[PDB]
């Protein structure tokens, strides 16, 4: 049986408690537009989604964000840095479903703390990236992010392509865990179309939502059974995107698939992408980097390696 | 008559005895580029030249540098911290012309001790600032600094505008002791132009030096008979810079002129500058702060006040 039934704080109440200013909303809109122009090929800068493997402390996230902002101010001519703020990953639930780390599962406090942290990060003038797992979480925090990613077992799910068609931000779809590009391509094509699904409204009520569709989409080359960052795999992805009637636009993830979840191989992947760009590649739009304060249960690279790698990429991409 | 005639150690010999590594030279080049981008308006961070009133002990300088580096790592998102290492000021001569404090005037030992200290400071990853009084001293230590200032009775001197056109670092020109902005503006305009003067070569020989000119210039609002940090004085400086065909780019010195050489008024000047930035000021590029370990024959602020003031500026500049 069900014993207690206590209403959760609605997205309206949450956004009223922790509100965006008009300036911050304009900044988020500008960053969304810039990322979408990068994806579309109208902006020469390379998109770089980089950040912690997962966020489980606001103070660690703020220190990483200060270092990240200081670095972005120095590589802003060639690279466009976006910080991924990943709370819940697909034990402990990750600061939103359990902010007290004691199984209490205080979801109201978790939502408030996450929104406060994201508001502080946006106030620093930092575009944010996320990976939507809960289809209803973009109703609570989606107004704070400038870029979203759709996952492996999440891409083929139709609920998530509908939610992606409902999102307001540029969006990258990851290929299949078996390396299937067709799933990502089809999710990208379907997210560009209007959709009608069952979600929640801003009053926290179950509702029927209608979506125009998301025209700002791209593929995330994540690697499956084998890495797919080589020029041959990139050309095959371009071929499949052209056959599907889409403009070749892909982001290479230096993380889990293309490095076998090993930290030492991420800079090599980034350097291969840079070399491909030097040889005239036109489809590679961005990179994805998992990087925490220290090296080392995901294998995220150290901050010293992140600084060195982004400096090398910035220094090598000058001619273009 | 002249009795003895002993050759001084040349810049080549001094740099060979205390050399920069390639990595440290690249670090100095990166910091010079970052400071110049801040001055030009391409970098959003605020330049902050801060440090001891004058250096007369390597150990004190190293302790201050450790604290300054620790603090810079925490305010790096909004502020760019540059440590002024001032040896000789315009009795005792200041550790270069008299490192033994006994009138022996061992200039070789002074140059070597200064270079060793500056090399240790650079090794800590700290950009250094200086004020060139001797026109030939930049030939011995100039490779170690990222920013230079040109002084009051030094600005109108043509030898120093030539030497500034010869410097490799970003440069700030102080207004006249009578508050004259025209002197600083004209020195800045002239230092941007090539020049041919008499100086010394790396072999310590008198030579004719030709200089491309220094395009990284800005005005230092130092205050004259009255302080000139108020929004009205800032607007007047912007007006005189625009009339001279220059982009308005100025640094506000919280020290001698704008505080009447009183330590208690520096944070108030800094807070006025922050308030001006909040009201939409676009010309103010940085601050200058004289701060030693303890309070109190220049009136430099204590390190506790320096920490508090930089933290307040960092916390107030967040929105931008």
Curated annotation (Swiss-Prot), chains A, B:
It catalyses: D-erythrose 4-phosphate + phosphoenolpyruvate + H2O = 7-phospho-2-dehydro-3-deoxy-D-arabino-heptonate + phosphate. One of its GO terms (molecular function) is identical protein binding. InterPro entries: Aldolase_TIM, DAHP1/KDSA, DAHP_synth_1. Pathway: Metabolic intermediate biosynthesis; chorismate biosynthesis; chorismate from D-erythrose 4-phosphate and phosphoenolpyruvate: step 1/7. Specifically feedback inhibited by tyrosine with 50% inhibition observed at 9 microM tyrosine, pH 7.0. Keywords: Amino-acid biosynthesis, Aromatic amino acid biosynthesis, Transferase. Its EC number is 2.5.1.54. Its cofactor is a divalent metal cation. Pfam families: DAHP_synth_1. One of its GO terms (cellular component) is cytoplasm. GO terms for biological process: amino acid biosynthetic process; aromatic amino acid family biosynthetic process; chorismate biosynthetic process. Stereospecific condensation of phosphoenolpyruvate (PEP) and D-erythrose-4-phosphate (E4P) giving rise to 3-deoxy-D-arabino-heptulosonate-7-phosphate (DAHP). There are 3 DAHP synthases, AroF is feedback-inhibited by Tyr. The other 2 DAHP synthases are Phe- and Trp-sensitive, respectively. Belongs to the class-I DAHP synthase family. This is Phospho-2-dehydro-3-deoxyheptonate aldolase, Tyr-sensitive. It comes from Escherichia coli (strain K12). The lineage of its organism: Bacteria, Pseudomonadati, Pseudomonadota, Gammaproteobacteria, Enterobacterales. The gene is aroF.
